[PDB]
Amino acid sequence: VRTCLPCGPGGKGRCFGPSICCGDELGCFVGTAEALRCQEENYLPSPCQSGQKPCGSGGRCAAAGICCSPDGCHEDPACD
Amino acid sequence: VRTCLPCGPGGKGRCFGPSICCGDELGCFVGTAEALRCQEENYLPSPCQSGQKPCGSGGRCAAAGICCSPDGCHEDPACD
């Protein structure tokens, strides 16, 4: 299954929602100029392949220590 | 107390913890380089002086429909 559309600086960040773009060496962008490209996952009633590590109540690990879900994001060492 | 420190893009942002920088018209930065000035909330009294409705669980309205909190920001329409 296809990965969740790239985003942010150098496309080195994958999407995690309508306004959440994150990367290992980037962090989680919630509702910002970077979360631009991720404004396309709307016209995609998915669930789409991401592949990182199932954490939290739905939010897969997005960036260094961030259980970053498609609705909001928080800190979770569970990601390391 | 001490109004939370300015951060990111033209300082038009504010610190919501040491890893989170959000702004109404900017969005919410979390774990990204733009929080390059918030870690300094560690060496300052906490909680700092914010100035928004206490959305979410002890969280804070930081952006557009976003309840940006020191541990995480989640989409919260209560913040419009």
Residue with tokens 């309840």: B67
Residue with tokens 């080195």: A12
Give chain B positions within 8 Å (CB) of A79.
none
Q: What is the domain extent for residue B68?
A: 1-80
Give chain A positions within 8 Å (CB) of B27.
19, 29-33, 35
Which residues, 6+ apart, have CB-to-CB distance to A75 below 8 Å? Answer: A65, A66, A67, B19, B71, B72
Residue A68 Cα, gap to closest chain B Cα (Å): 9
C-alpha dihedral sign at B79, A43, A34, B31: positive
Query: Rounded CA gap, B76 and B28, in Å?
Result: 13
Which residues, 6+ apart, have CB-to-CB distance to B75 below 8 Å? Answer: A19, A31, A71, A72, B65, B66, B67
Of A32, A68, A72, the CB nearest to B29: A32
Closest residue of chain A to B56, computed from CA coordinates: A72
**Helix residue spans in A1-80 (DSSP H):** none
The per-residue b/e assignment along B29-46, b for 16 or more CB within 10 angstroms, e otherwise, is: bbbbebbebbeebeeeee
Q: Specify the number of domains making up chain A.
A: 1
Query: Rounded CA gap, B3 and B1, in Å?
Result: 7
Which residues, 6+ apart, have CB-to-CB distance to A18 below 8 Å? Answer: A35, A38, A39, A41, A42, A70
Residue with tokens 């296809």: A2
Let me know how many helices (H) and strands (E) chain A has, helices first.
Answer: 0, 7
Residue B2 Cα, gap to closest chain A Cα (Å): 24
E strand or H helix at A75: strand A72-75
CATH number at residue B73: 2.60.9.10
What is the DSSP pairing of strand B27-30 with strand B20-23? antiparallel
Please give the single-letter amino acid code of residue B57: S
**Helix residue spans in B1-80 (DSSP H):** none
Q: Structure tokens of A68?
A: 């970053």
Q: Structure tokens of B59?
A: 């969280």
Residue B63 Cα, gap to closest chain A Cα (Å): 8
DSSP state of B35: G
Give chain A positions within 8 Å (CB) of B29.
27, 29-30, 32
Of B19, B64, B72, the CB nearest to A72: B72
